Amino acid sequence: TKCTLKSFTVEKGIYQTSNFRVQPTESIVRFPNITNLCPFGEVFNATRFASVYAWNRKRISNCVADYSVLYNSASFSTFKCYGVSPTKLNDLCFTNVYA
Amino acid sequence: SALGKLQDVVNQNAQALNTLVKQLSSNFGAISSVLNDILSRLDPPEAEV
Amino acid sequence: QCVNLTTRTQLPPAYTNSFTRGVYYPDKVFRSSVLHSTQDLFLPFFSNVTWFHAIHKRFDNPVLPFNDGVYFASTEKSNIIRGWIFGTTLDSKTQSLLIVNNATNVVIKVCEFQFCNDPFLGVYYMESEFRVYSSANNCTFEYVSQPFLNFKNLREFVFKNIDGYFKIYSKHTPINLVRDLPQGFSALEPLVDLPIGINITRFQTLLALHRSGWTAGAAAYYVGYLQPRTFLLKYNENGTITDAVDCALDPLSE
Amino acid sequence: FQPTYGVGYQPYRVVVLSFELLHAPATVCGPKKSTNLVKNKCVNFNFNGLTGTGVLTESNKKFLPFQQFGRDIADTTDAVRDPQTLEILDITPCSFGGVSVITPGTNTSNQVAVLYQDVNCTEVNVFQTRAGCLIGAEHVNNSYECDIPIGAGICASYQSIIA
Ligand SMILES: *[C@@H]1O[C@H](CO)[C@@H](O[C@@H]2O[C@H](CO)[C@@H](O)[C@H](O)[C@H]2NC(C)=O)[C@H](O)[C@H]1NC(C)=O
Ligand SMILES: *[C@@H]1O[C@H](CO)[C@@H](O)[C@H](O)[C@H]1NC(C)=O
Ligand SMILES: *[C@@H]1O[C@H](CO)[C@@H](O)[C@H](O)[C@H]1NC(C)=O
Ligand SMILES: *[C@@H]1O[C@H](CO)[C@@H](O)[C@H](O)[C@H]1NC(C)=O
Ligand SMILES: *[C@@H]1O[C@H](CO)[C@@H](O)[C@H](O)[C@H]1NC(C)=O
Ligand SMILES: *[C@@H]1O[C@H](CO)[C@@H](O)[C@H](O)[C@H]1NC(C)=O
Ligand SMILES: *[C@@H]1O[C@H](CO)[C@@H](O)[C@H](O)[C@H]1NC(C)=O
Ligand SMILES: *[C@@H]1O[C@H](CO)[C@@H](O)[C@H](O)[C@H]1NC(C)=O
User: Fold this and answer.
1) How far is CA D74 from CA B16, B23, C34, D64, in A?
2) What are the disulfide bonds (chain C)?
């Protein structure tokens, strides 16, 4: 109060000095259920793959893709990404994915 | 309409407060009226503008 | 397969009054006991809505411009109207949207169809006649969904195509009026928000034949166009739109 | 492709994923973490891209099944639907108010009392008034003439500081 009124002596009364803004405790992020997942099992775990002169191309749209399971799978001998990152792949939304 | 003189004062105060809160939804020429959208969408040199 | 239908009777399309129909929920926001003003693509009150018939010999399937948005009203019994066709040139040069509801399931496709000049469905008296397109080359989108569907049903739809998002607002109303649109209020709930991202300037609805030549079942539909305007919407204690005001209709509503 | 081949001649299945952004609405994106939901606390909420800070309590507003958000007259989101469990939550804003100091003259005494305006006493000689929570003043049942005004019929005086 002495600092607010710029005086070392304060008269009798009520003096508004500051504000009590409660600080947020936690952070809660809520999103809908993960449903209609992409058919990565239809591409990767296919019984017979195509030959390279007649390579199969599969159009992927309208689905949510977990690339973290693909990266965390140790069975892949080579996983090179040239313009993205796995965290970026989890955080970039793309119109078309061609397998 | 017997007590219209008090009701005009109450309505003017409520309308002034309502317009004051409605002014927060205007961007005033900025890209958005939300500060968090500007802090999440832009670097600080343009965000300060 | 395509078939020209050559037993039509020449007649101009009719016109009638919209009354207070064509209203839909502008957003996904609950509002309770308040009045909210919105500037959206709306159908004007008491507007000139175009009337097409299917009666026996009238079989109305013309191809209409989409404009900025379409209100489709259907005074329907026994489910003659099955779907719609949207696009710009309606051939394989451009890309077109197809909406159908056949006897089983609701199919939404975005392909380059080579459409017939007269596409239709057909029910034999069982449904056994499908003449919509002759080819489908480059399909970029598929979506399979739930069944949407004296005249006994009023089916009101609003189609918008804004920012690549195709909004279908729908409402089903039990009616018992014989000929024209009922006079009343019914807000259209949003049904499907559809991510297509294509240009749409012209549309055409799909009817179904009855075979026993062909016979057109008794149905009637209405086409209106949306314009950007403001409505003042009233929201009750349950959050349901019960009344609306067209601000540009007359000075009293202004 | 015999099984006795050396590495470099063994068959390798290769999948190449090509990602692209066009002049179209983008729809393939990674899953978004949905943490546990807490109530009756002042938290930073993020409901389907709608961010903010508020206490999330249980709501009596019965939403229509298509509606997700809720606004008052002054266009502030006061209601929300949880996307995980189809339930309705009210957002009350986090507790705020003025902090006022009630004192006599410094010639008289250095004792002070603190008024937290519009603040409940359980979340800040503690007495709950309609003007706010008053800390440092002993509430008495006797009535005197108003010396220092607090508000809502409450006044403070020095005799210790009484309210
Ligand atoms: C049904 O009628 C339409 C219109 O007369 C036919 O469309 C014509 O098709 C011929 C085929 O060579 C074209 O040369 C014309 O330019 C088309 N005219 C129009 C206005 O599109 C359609 O082919 C007919 N259907 C069948 C099965 O014959
Ligand atoms: C393929 O099979 C492996 C082997 O068990 C399994 O772990 C995985 O979930 C399957 N799907 C994909 C997409 O890798
Ligand atoms: C509707 O338009 C037609 C011509 O397009 C016209 O003959 C008719 O009078 C119009 N009705 C009204 C109410 O304007
Ligand atoms: C959409 O189609 C119309 C008519 O076909 C054309 O004039 C317009 O330029 C097109 N717009 C785009 C973005 O392709
Ligand atoms: C309805 O159309 C879908 C998509 O073409 C098809 O799979 C289904 O068999 C059709 N139903 C009937 C009864 O033909
Ligand atoms: C569309 O189809 C035609 C003919 O099938 C083909 O030549 C063309 O490359 C296709 N375009 C796209 C973008 O798929
Ligand atoms: C609101 O819903 C209640 C049921 O809880 C109903 O009794 C009331 O009639 C509804 N309001 C209107 C205006 O119909
Ligand atoms: C999502 O998962 C929750 C988990 O309890 C479940 O209750 C709910 O039915 C699921 N679906 C939707 C659409 O919320």
Assistant:
1) 12, 10, 11, 21
2) 2-116, 111-139
